[PDB]
Amino acid sequence: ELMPKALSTRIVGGIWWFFTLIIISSYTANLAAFLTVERMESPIDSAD
């Protein structure tokens, strides 16, 4: 509910929003790989 008013605190409010934008976006984009677990792949599949 608290918002920065002075421009002295807007850049702190601005950069921290851009910081937590990339953290959460890199979190969601990576977590698609870790829930879709690639299964057990013992490195023999055929006689070849």
Binding site: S26, N30, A33, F34, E38, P43
Partner: protein, 48 residues
């Protein structure tokens, strides 16, 4: 050697083997080894 009665006999004979494909069959028999698991084998990427 410098003039042999066995050059042309082999010159025709090598052309028979690649027509049959045995020069390619022996190629894949020795140069094909382990698959050397590629750079696109990520399987996990914890962001650091």
């Amino acid at each position: 050697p410098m003039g042999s009665p066995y050059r042309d006999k082999i010159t025709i004979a090598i052309l028979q083997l690649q027509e049959e494909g045995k020069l390619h069959m022996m190629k894949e028999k020795w140069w094909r080894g382990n698959g050397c698991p590629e750079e696109e084998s990520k399987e996990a990427s914890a962001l650091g």
